[PDB]
Each structure stands twice: as structure tokens, then as C-alpha cells.
């Protein structure tokens, strides 16, 4: 084998799939997560997609007095 990449293959309806493509193109999560587009219902993404999403949602929380000294 020449090219190989560890990751996560996702299978989902045509709607959700287009949404992932939209999220990836717009960097709505702060960073790209799509390694390769495949089918209209399949996409190969980074293994740590959940962490990325968990990290993005954190910034969405309400700002407080410690928002800048801790983050």
C-alpha cells in the first residue's frame, strides 16, 4: 500500500452529509475535519471529530470573569 490514513468513515442520509460538508467548508468547528469525500451518504473524517466538536461547543458557552485568564 502507498497511501493510508487512520480515521472514521461515516454513513448518513444525504441531508446530514451535506451538512457535514457545509460545516467543514465554513470551518464552523474552528478546523477542517473532512479527510475525503466519498459518496452522497459517506464521508471519511478525522478520528478525533468528537473532541473537535466538544472543543467548539465550549467556546459557545457564556462568557464569565475567568474567560480570558483561563482560556
GROMACS .gro file of C-alpha atoms in nm:
model
   71
    1UNK     CA    1   0.000   0.000   0.000
    2UNK     CA    2   0.115   0.355  -0.071
    3UNK     CA    3  -0.136   0.595   0.078
    4UNK     CA    4  -0.303   0.515   0.412
    5UNK     CA    5  -0.486   0.719   0.673
    6UNK     CA    6  -0.648   0.626   1.006
    7UNK     CA    7  -0.985   0.787   1.064
    8UNK     CA    8  -1.359   0.747   1.078
    9UNK     CA    9  -1.594   0.653   0.797
   10UNK     CA   10  -1.941   0.792   0.840
   11UNK     CA   11  -2.260   0.670   0.673
   12UNK     CA   12  -2.563   0.900   0.693
   13UNK     CA   13  -2.857   1.035   0.494
   14UNK     CA   14  -2.796   1.282   0.208
   15UNK     CA   15  -2.908   1.571   0.430
   16UNK     CA   16  -2.672   1.521   0.725
   17UNK     CA   17  -2.387   1.451   0.479
   18UNK     CA   18  -2.433   1.785   0.304
   19UNK     CA   19  -2.442   1.948   0.647
   20UNK     CA   20  -2.103   1.799   0.736
   21UNK     CA   21  -1.963   1.931   0.407
   22UNK     CA   22  -2.108   2.270   0.494
   23UNK     CA   23  -1.959   2.259   0.844
   24UNK     CA   24  -1.619   2.161   0.705
   25UNK     CA   25  -1.611   2.422   0.427
   26UNK     CA   26  -1.717   2.702   0.661
   27UNK     CA   27  -1.483   2.594   0.944
   28UNK     CA   28  -1.779   2.620   1.180
   29UNK     CA   29  -1.586   2.396   1.419
   30UNK     CA   30  -1.269   2.603   1.403
   31UNK     CA   31  -1.095   2.344   1.189
   32UNK     CA   32  -1.140   2.106   0.896
   33UNK     CA   33  -1.247   1.751   0.974
   34UNK     CA   34  -1.316   1.602   0.633
   35UNK     CA   35  -1.022   1.399   0.509
   36UNK     CA   36  -1.202   1.271   0.200
   37UNK     CA   37  -1.543   1.294   0.038
   38UNK     CA   38  -1.676   0.961  -0.083
   39UNK     CA   39  -2.040   0.900  -0.167
   40UNK     CA   40  -2.360   1.101  -0.124
   41UNK     CA   41  -2.403   0.912   0.204
   42UNK     CA   42  -2.038   0.851   0.301
   43UNK     CA   43  -1.752   1.069   0.426
   44UNK     CA   44  -1.415   0.978   0.580
   45UNK     CA   45  -1.337   1.215   0.871
   46UNK     CA   46  -1.063   1.264   1.134
   47UNK     CA   47  -1.064   1.019   1.424
   48UNK     CA   48  -1.096   1.299   1.681
   49UNK     CA   49  -1.408   1.460   1.536
   50UNK     CA   50  -1.592   1.432   1.868
   51UNK     CA   51  -1.312   1.612   2.059
   52UNK     CA   52  -1.316   1.886   1.795
   53UNK     CA   53  -1.691   1.928   1.834
   54UNK     CA   54  -1.660   1.911   2.214
   55UNK     CA   55  -1.396   2.183   2.195
   56UNK     CA   56  -1.603   2.405   1.965
   57UNK     CA   57  -1.915   2.388   2.182
   58UNK     CA   58  -1.709   2.502   2.481
   59UNK     CA   59  -1.634   2.837   2.319
   60UNK     CA   60  -2.010   2.873   2.268
   61UNK     CA   61  -2.071   2.880   2.641
   62UNK     CA   62  -2.146   3.207   2.819
   63UNK     CA   63  -1.852   3.435   2.889
   64UNK     CA   64  -1.756   3.498   3.252
   65UNK     CA   65  -1.489   3.677   3.460
   66UNK     CA   66  -1.238   3.396   3.400
   67UNK     CA   67  -1.297   3.358   3.024
   68UNK     CA   68  -0.966   3.525   2.933
   69UNK     CA   69  -0.739   3.429   3.223
   70UNK     CA   70  -0.821   3.060   3.186
   71UNK     CA   71  -0.888   3.047   2.811
   0.00000   0.00000   0.00000
